[PDB]
Paper text:
In particular, RORγt, whose activity is required for the proliferation and functionality of immune Th17 cells, is the subject of intense investigation to modulate its activity to achieve clinical benefit. NRs are characterized by the ability to bind small ligands at a highly conserved hydrophobic orthosteric-binding pocket located within the protein's ligand-binding domain (LBD). Helix 12 (H12, also called activation function-2, AF-2) can adopt distinct conformations in response to ligand binding, regulating the interaction of the LBD with cofactor proteins with resulting changes in gene transcription at a particular locus. Here we characterize the mode of action of these inhibitors to guide an optimization program and surprisingly find a novel binding mode, thereby identifying the first allosteric-binding pocket for a highly potent, cellular active small NR ligand.
To elucidate the molecular basis of RORγt modulation by MRL-871, we performed co-crystallization studies with an equimolar complex of RORγt-LBD and MRL-871. Co-crystals grew in two different space groups. Crystals in space group P6122 had unit cell dimensions of a=b=108.5, c=104.7 Å, diffracted to 2.2 Å resolution and also contain one molecule per asymmetric unit. The overall structures from both sets were identical in all the features and the ligand conformation. MRL-871 binds instead to a previously unidentified allosteric pocket in the RORγt LBD, located distal to the classical binding site (orange). Crystal structure analysis shows that this allosteric pocket, absent in the classical NR-folding motif, is formed by helices 4, 5, 11 and the reoriented flexible H12. Hydrogen-bonding interactions exist between the molecule's carboxylic acid group and the side chain of RORγt residue Q329 as well as the main-chain amide hydrogen atoms of residues A497 and F498. The unique conformation induced by the binding of MRL-871 prevents interaction with cofactor peptides, which typically bind RORγt through a conserved LXXLL motif, at the AF-2. MRL-871, however, effectively antagonizes the RORγt coactivator peptide recruitment interaction, independent of cholesterol concentration. In contrast, the inverse agonist T0901317 competes for the same binding site as cholesterol, resulting in a competitive displacement and a cholesterol concentration-dependent increase of the IC50 value for T0901317; that is, RORγt binding and inhibition by T0901317 becomes less potent in the presence of agonistic ligands. Together, these data demonstrate that the allosteric inhibition of coactivator binding to RORγt by MRL-871 is both potent and independent of orthosteric site occupancy.
Residue numbers in the entry: 267 to 507
The structure:
């Protein structure tokens, strides 16, 4: 009946609503794998057509994350500057965590455009180092067998973090962070899943992967810019110069 147990239900709701695909849909489609003809078709496409495809899927992913943040109790109550600071540093980190749901650790494939395919699908992009890192991060995260409420609460904490440089009302972020930590700890105790806390990825790993990802995305956006209808215009202008 506590203010925290509600916070749990509310975070789980925002997440359920901003969830692009349902987990059992992703799990059942684990059989639906791209054929060598389909893989070759992706590999033979231009760098620029594979880029427009991936950039549009990644922008859509960020927009679901912005909506997940918007629906978190207290997020709107922060000043616009703090909202930008938190989403600029964390939105893509959330997108990267969420990918573990579309990842199949057995055949090392990811759900991309209706079917499951390996990293070979992305050859055309010519950044096999970054793509291998993304797949390796999803592969490590998959061993935790994250549940839907775990991903929800963990991703809310990835976003609500008072240790992001440039925050104005720092104590207002701390107040939201500490409530979400309590919700996360409380929830893990209730379900006997406190063991995942020791297995969680180090804060630096995520931060590092994401900065590399976003810089590679920024280079591609400079060379071949895609156009997106901004869900959060002040955030969009902070990433798209
Ligand atoms: O709809 C919006 O308001 C919105 C929509 C998307 C963002 C956003 N894009 N982004 C990218 O990395 C990105 C993507 Cl996903 C595709 C193509 C180019 C880019 C790049 F130019 F920024 F590099 C981000 C990283 C971190 C945080 C927010 C965002 C921001 C706002």
């Amino acid at each position: 009946l506590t203010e925290i147990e509600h916070l749990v239900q509310s975070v789980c709701k925002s997440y359920r609503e901003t969830c692009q695909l349902r987990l059992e849909d992703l799990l059942r489609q684990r059989s639906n794998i791209f054929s060598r003809e389909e893989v070759t078709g992706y590999q033979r496409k231009s760098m620029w057509e594979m880029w427009e495809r991936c950039a549009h899927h990644l922008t859509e992913a960020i927009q679901y994350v912005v909506e997940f943040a918007k629906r978190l109790s207290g997020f709107m109550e922060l000043c616009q500057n703090d909202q930008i600071v938190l989403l600029k540093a964390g939105a893509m980190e959330v997108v990267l965590v969420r990918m573990c749901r579309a990842y199949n650790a057995d055949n090392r494939t990811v759900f991309f455009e209706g079917k499951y395919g390996g990293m070979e699908l992305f050859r055309a992009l010519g950044c096999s180092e970054l793509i291998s890192s993304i797949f390796d991060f999803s592969h490590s995260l998959s061993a935790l067998h994250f549940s839907e409420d775990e991903i929800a609460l963990y991703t809310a904490l990835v976003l609500i973090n008072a240790h992001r440089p440039g925050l104005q009302e720092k104590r207002k972020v701390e107040q939201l962070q500490y409530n979400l930590e309590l919700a996360f700890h409380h929830h893990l105790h209730k379900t006997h899943r406190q063991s995942i806390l020791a297995k969680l990825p180090p804060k630096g790993k995520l931060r590092s992967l994401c900065s590399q990802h976003v810089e590679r995305l920024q280079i591609f956006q400079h060379l071949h810019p895609i156009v997106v209808q901004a869900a959060f215009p002040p955030l969009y202008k902070e990433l798209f110069s």
